Design a protein around this ligand. Structure first.
Ligand SMILES: Cc1cc2nc3c(=O)[nH]c(=O)nc-3n(C[C@H](O)[C@H](O)[C@H](O)COP(=O)(O)O)c2cc1C
Lengths: 163, 131, 845
């Protein structure tokens, strides 16, 4: 599979969904951060902080602005990076969901060998694994691998790549 | 505020600036020009006391710190000479050479005489020549 | 004699110098603690896994303190006293654990829960070492307050800050069990008793009130709705605010009377006001447990009577689904309305009150800001008002960047609050009498002479202590009936504020920072420990810290950017602003103007007149045109004098031939002081090139709208050592103008511009004299819009200079310009429709 930089909309969408504890498609893209959780105001500044740490530069009043036109303005100053918030979410998932010993490396090599998706798709498939967090002890390596395969076809379905 | 035709640009700006000074002076110094803090020269300031001292520049000495020391505190000629990054060459603007001469390298001993008196102030750089 | 003992978890380790006489006892714990301690993993990202050595010493301390008995002498008493002392020496270099936790957050890959467990462990060790916080802390803040460099004031939040308030209490019980466990045990006891003292309390408390069991067992903790009910939420919010107060007093080693003595004055937000007077009584740790008993009893009796005066009813699912489809929120008795003026919302409530009878009417309760209000009333009524408002607001994603400012449909926010009772409404008046009778029956009465510091009344903003009548009855009236006016009750002149209310960064503190932004007041979130990246307000650490960290002063714009005077040797008086300091000329410049400032003969004249002017690029369409003009100016100007070049970003031809040229003339070193890029802000990449490669003194920019402004800040944020002149102009300017009012975008941005001292802020458009500019120079111009003073660093005059003699405009052109009357700032937005003082708006190509 050819290399493509991860779009900001997907990373934006998994970061909002992973704070909401919610799935990858239950958030509608044409909606404002302030609309989603209009009741409470803690997750407001928490998500705004999380988006700040991810992509550094943030526009004034992101909460009133829809995610789709926020994604394009984020994409302008973002270049396929992971950043501090996605790095700290990934390590957490790989240590507590994936078994001890099964770290990011072995998990990246499994997708690189079995599927042959490059290092930029590994970010995407890992981010889709955050958005639909297993929330369980995946001690069985086989189980974890099979979940990664159902996260490889979820990544391929949202982006449109053929496997 | 456009009525008077062919009023010299110098006469308009001066008229505005002096109208400002006139309103600041009345409301912050009760019309006393003696209360204005004077300096030798006003400018060059970025928006971010020993009569005879001795500095020993290193190959680790901070350039900013070094120059601030060598300049001193008081607004005088040596203040400009060490801080100003550009000097004039007729109508031309060129990298201040004095800053390049005194640029802090290992072996550079600066002495100052009359640090408190600008008019008599004498910096005497010293280097190992032949040893 | 010492036998070293190393304790490790994967890569990281720590060495402790145990004494050889008691080393067998510590080397018995080495294995047993490393048994409790989980397996090493990469990053230590797993929860309950120490990331730093300090965290590993912490978890050791917590394990050692766990097994030790505080009543019975153990073998592990001196082992706890040596490992804690070693922790204290190595890591706690004077500062409080809070300052270290804060340092680990922003340095290490440490999550928040890892600081909470660390602090819990360390505070358990210190107290259970038989080493209480009995010594006085050297906190820079409270040292400065004693000195008189700061004046603290305590504020206390109330309802509607957060839904899951209980979770702020849960954390404290976990993290400060040793400090507040007794007070929580007291209140828990007090409430358990009070419900048997009130005839029909138990009726209200359907799932009980065993808060101790709810803290111990999350499973036993009832459903969130039941917690949010005012009979439970009222007292417990008191207990949280008392908790945070107590934790701060202990960790500073102050008595409740000592800390109360340090604050200039206290005050609260609605039911918080009861907590504010609770601390105003207390004197020592002994008389404290009746002052709480008082407070909690008030919050018990309001909390119940208000529920029996207006019980929340079931709402039809039709309303819920409609409200959740619009996605405003679940309907509540209190509706927040942001970004609207009081008269506008007053208008809308009149219209909604007109339709409905007195028994269903809404009223404005909170006036938390200038454009922050909360309406109260029945959740039917407020829904009906939310219906009325949704027709008046613009859609969220609607672009009014092209629509002229005036006729842009106003956009604002309206969410319901996470609260169960309409506080400060006529609906809770009937509880008033049963509250007073109950308060007198249970022997609660605040005495003016017993109160030590001034508490400020939420209604008028006067001291409570001056009351002729009962203080309790006024406080009850102020909570249940009288509307809070938060700006009116925060008129005091403090230097610091301590938010002890729940919510923390979503609590009253942040709101009060926004209200007093730029008035030199620093707010500290005492209730929550975190890190603010902006560093505009503080968290717990700033209270406790002893270094220069603990004392962070919020900048006062009037003082920091005061327009001073100066004079050189030759008696030439300048105005000495941030701009004038750099350039060493007055702060009045002539912008870039095609075609006024293309003529060298005018640019050279004004530069010799002693003022900075930009030679306009827009008159010359080739490198040879610049060079001929530049050199024609150079040959006219006096020695050592410089001028600026204006370019146009929306002419990529003129940039692509003109930028390399300026770079070549500046590498040779022509007197081009600065470059301005009018009409469109450049990207962070191009802007970085302009800053580095050209080698100019500074870079003028002419941002059009908010989006531009924020892109300028971002450019300055990248090169904080390079000056950036932000030449903000309104649409009311001559030439290519935006649709934006001159003032309103500065009101909503100034704060975020002044966070970078490298941005010289220049205000242009509609200026011609001293008298009209002066308010902007001094900063009093913002007093008209009820903001703090907001002084500016410069002033550019486009149209004022067109009629100047040296300008090459044809005499009859001058006579035509003079002939034009002009218009006041109000009317400029009629230029779109018809000639307005002889000036109209047309379209370019
Ligand atoms: C005759 C005229 C020519 C102008 N030319 C330019 C220009 O070439 N580039 C630019 O960025 N702004 C230009 N402007 C805008 C000015 O630089 C300045 O922002 C504006 O004039 C301030 O408004 P005022 O004219 O009401 O003082 C021009 C304005 C006028 C009146």
């Amino acid at each position: 599979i050819a290399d493509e930089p991860v779009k900001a909309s997907l990373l934006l969408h998994v970061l909002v969904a992973h704070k909401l504890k919610k799935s990858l498609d239950s958030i509608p893209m044409s909606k404002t951060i302030k609309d989603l959780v209009g009741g409470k105001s803690t997750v407001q500044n928490e998500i705004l902080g999380d988006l700040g740490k991810e992509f550094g530069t943030t526009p004034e009043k992101p909460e009133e602005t829809p995610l789709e036109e926020l994604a394009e303005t984020f994409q302008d100053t973002f270049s396929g990076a992971l950043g501090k918030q996605s790095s700290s979410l990934l390590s957490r998932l790989i240590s507590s969901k994936m078994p001890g010993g099964f770290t990011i490396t072995v998990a990246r090599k499994y997708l690189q060998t079995r599927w042959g998706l490059p290092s930029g798709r590994q970010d995407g498939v890992l981010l889709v694994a955050l958005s639909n967090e297993p929330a369980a002890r995946l001690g069985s390596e086989a189980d974890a691998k099979a979940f990664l395969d159902s996260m490889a076809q979820k990544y391929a379905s949202i982006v449109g790549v053929d496997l | 505020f456009t009525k008077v035709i062919d009023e010299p640009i110098k006469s308009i700006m001066d008229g505005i600036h002096d109208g400002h000074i006139k309103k600041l002076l009345h409301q912050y110094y009760g019309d006393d020009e003696s209360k204005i803090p004077a300096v030798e020269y006003f400018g060059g300031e970025s928006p971010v006391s020993e009569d005879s001292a001795v500095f020993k520049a290193t190959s680790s000495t901070d350039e900013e710190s070094w120059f601030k020391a060598l300049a001193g505190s008081e607004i005088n000629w040596r203040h400009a000479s060490f801080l100003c990054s550009f000097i004039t060459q007729d109508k031309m603007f060129v990298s201040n050479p004095i800053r390049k001469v005194f640029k802090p390298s290992q072996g550079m001993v600066v002495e100052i005489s009359n640090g408190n008196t600008s008019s008599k102030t004498v910096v005497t750089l010293s280097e190992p020549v032949q040893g | 004699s010492t036998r070293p003992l190393t304790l490790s978890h994967g890569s990281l380790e720590h060495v402790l110098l145990v004494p050889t006489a008691s080393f067998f006892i510590a080397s018995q714990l080495q294995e047993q603690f490393n048994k409790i301690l989980p397996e090493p993993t990469e990053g230590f990202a797993a929860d309950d896994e120490p990331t730093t050595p300090a965290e590993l010493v912490g978890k050791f301390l917590g394990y050692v303190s766990s097994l030790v008995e505080p009543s019975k002498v153990g073998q592990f008493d001196q082992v706890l006293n040596l490992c804690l002392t070693e922790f204290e020496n190595c890591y706690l270099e004077g500062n409080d654990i809070h300052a270290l936790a804060a340092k680990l957050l922003q340095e290490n890959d440490t999550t928040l829960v890892k600081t909470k467990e660390l602090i819990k462990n360390y505070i358990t060790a210190r107290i259970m070492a038989k080493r209480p916080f009995d010594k006085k802390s050297n906190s820079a803040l409270f040292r400065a307050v004693g000195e008189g460099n700061a004046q603290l004031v305590a504020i206390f939040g109330g309802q509607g800050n957060t839904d899951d308030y209980f979770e702020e209490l849960r954390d404290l019980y976990q993290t400060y069990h040793v400090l507040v466990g007794d007070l929580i045990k007291f209140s828990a006891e007090t409430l358990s008793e009070l419900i048997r003292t009130t005839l029909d309390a138990e009726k209200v408390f359907t799932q009980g009130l065993n808060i101790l069991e709810w803290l111990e067992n999350p499973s036993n903790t009832p459903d969130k709705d039941y917690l949010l009910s005012i009979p439970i939420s009222c007292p417990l919010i008191g207990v949280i605010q008392l908790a945070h107060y107590v934790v701060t007093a202990k960790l500073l080693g102050f008595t409740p009377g000592e800390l109360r003595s340090y604050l200039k004055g206290a005050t609260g937000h609605s039911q918080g006001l009861v907590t504010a007077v609770a601390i105003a009584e207390t004197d020592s740790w002994e008389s404290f447990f009746v002052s709480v008993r008082k407070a909690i009893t008030v919050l018990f009796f309001i909390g119940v009577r208000c529920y029996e005066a207006y019980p929340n009813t079931s709402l039809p699912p039709s309303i819920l689904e409609d409200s959740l489809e619009n996605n405003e929120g679940v309907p509540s008795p209190m509706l927040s309305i942001s970004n609207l003026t009081q008269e506008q919302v007053q208008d809308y409530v009149n219209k909604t009150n007109s339709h409905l009878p007195a028994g269903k009417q809404v009223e404005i309760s909170l006036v938390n800001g200038a454009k922050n209000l909360v309406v109260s009333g029945p959740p039917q009524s407020l829904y009906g008002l939310n219906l009325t408002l949704r027709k008046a607001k613009a859609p969220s994603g609607l672009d009014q960047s092209r629509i002229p400012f005036s006729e842009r449909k106003l956009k604002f926010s309206n969410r319901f609050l996470p609260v169960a009772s309409p506080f400060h409404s006529h609906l809770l008046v009937p509880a008033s009498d049963l509250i007073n009778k109950d308060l007198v029956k249970n022997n609660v009465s605040f005495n003016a002479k017993d109160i030590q510091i001034p508490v400020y009344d939420t209604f008028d903003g006067s001291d409570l202590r001056v009351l002729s009548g009962s203080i309790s009855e006024r406080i009850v009236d102020c909570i249940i009936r009288l509307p809070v006016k938060w700006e009116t009750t925060t008129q005091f002149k403090a230097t610091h504020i301590l938010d002890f209310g729940p919510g923390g960064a979503s609590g009253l503190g942040v709101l009060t920072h926004r209200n007093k932004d730029g008035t030199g007041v620093r707010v500290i979130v005492a209730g929550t420990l975190d890190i603010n990246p902006d560093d505009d307000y503080g968290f717990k650490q700033e209270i406790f810290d002893v270094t220069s960290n603990g004392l962070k002063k919020n900048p006062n714009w009037l003082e920091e950017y005061h327009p001073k005077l100066i004079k050189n040797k030759s008696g030439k008086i300048f105005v000495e602003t941030k701009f004038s300091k750099l350039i060493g000329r007055p702060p009045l410049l002539v912008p870039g103007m095609t075609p006024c400032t293309v003529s060298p003969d005018f640019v050279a004249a004004t530069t010799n007149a002693g003022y900075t002017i930009e030679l306009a690029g827009g008159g010359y369409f080739s490198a040879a045109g610049m060079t001929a003009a530049i050199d024609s100016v150079v040959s006219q100007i006096e020695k050592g004098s410089t001028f600026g070049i204006n370019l146009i970003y929306v002419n990529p031809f003129m940039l692509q031939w003109g930028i390399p040229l300026i770079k070549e003339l500046r590498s040779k070193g022509y007197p081009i002081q600065f470059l301005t890029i009018g009409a469109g802000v450049p990207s962070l990449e191009v802007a970085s090139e302009y800053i580095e490669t050209l080698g100019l003194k500074y870079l003028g920019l002419k941002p059009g709208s908010i989006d531009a402004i924020s892109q300028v800040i971002n450019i300055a944020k990248a090169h904080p050592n390079f000056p950036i002149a932000l030449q903000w102009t309104g649409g009311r300017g001559g030439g290519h103008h935006s649709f934006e009012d001159a003032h309103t975008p500065m009101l909503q941005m100034y704060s975020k511009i002044r966070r970078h001292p490298n941005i010289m802020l220049i205000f242009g458009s509609g200026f011609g004299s001293a008298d009209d500019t002066y308010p902007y120079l001094t900063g009093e111009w913002s007093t008209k819009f009820d903001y703090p003073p907001m002084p500016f660093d410069g002033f550019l005059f486009g149209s004022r200079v067109m009629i100047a003699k040296e300008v090459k405009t044809s005499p009859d052109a001058k006579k035509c310009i003079a002939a034009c009357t002009g218009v006041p700032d109000d009317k400029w937005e009629q230029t779109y429709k018809k000639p307005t003082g002889g000036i109209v708006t047309v379209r370019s190509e």
